[PDB]
Amino acid sequence: GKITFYEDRGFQGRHYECSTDHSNLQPYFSRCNSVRVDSGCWMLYEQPNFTGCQYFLRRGDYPDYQQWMGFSDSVRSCRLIPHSSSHRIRIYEREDYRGQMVEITDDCPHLQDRFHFSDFHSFHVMEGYWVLYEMPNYRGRQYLLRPGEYRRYHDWGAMNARVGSLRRIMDF
Template identity: 30%
Template sequence: MVCWVGYEKEGFRGHQYVLEEGEYHDWRVWGGCDSELRSVRVIRADLKDPMLVMFEQPDEEQGDMQEENTFEVTQAIPDVEPFGYKTNTLSIQVINGAWIAYSHVDFSGHQYILEKGFYNNCADWGSEDTRICSVQPILLVRTIMERKNGL
């Protein structure tokens, strides 16, 4: 299976959408904000054993005195706050797999496709905002025929 990232604007900018193999007869099918889809690229990642680490933005009132809070993730998290992580993210390191980070809880809002590597700030993941409220890995789903053939 091949997954693609579709972008609202040319040059891989703007809203991001995960596109799997198949037909999209209407922009609402891919979850678009509108019908604009100006650039696409293949997601290049080993989709097994997903893992990422999120680094929380320190509170400005506490300055550098605050201990760095990190959040290690290996599965879908619909809301980061119950895990003691605030929604303002300083940076993200994708250790393995490909991920979708969302600006709102329950996998909603703006989505950002993250592949293996280090994202130093929100601009690196394509946002103007540090808010990340939910994350989920992109997983391969094996078909019945693949399971029967031991693939």
């Protein structure tokens, strides 16, 4: 993967070219107002050590932070997401994998309108990498889901349980 961060919008100012995970981008730039993703899928984080607001970016140009649904120009850590040939997630109605469950291997732009139940509080990522979104149609706060278990919203870095859609991460 290759991503370039720029301090000013429109791909101006101090820039940093990156091809790896970084827990601390502050030595290389103090603000990020535009990005060019040359290759790969990336999760950016507002704060160091993969904390704070999260943003999913893939191949393409982002001339302003609003284009990655940024809450500000802060980017202080990043993950290159590895390739997934398959995606499988279990979605549960209640915390700790209780209540109704559905198992999917595709994207879901609207959780509420699609299944047999109406509430979504825990997830088991069986295969691949996903982005969980606060609102329908892949909008709002974003949370990376990696293979593994998410018993309640704190496990996915949320400050509350609001969710609305789910997208597989695939190359771009």
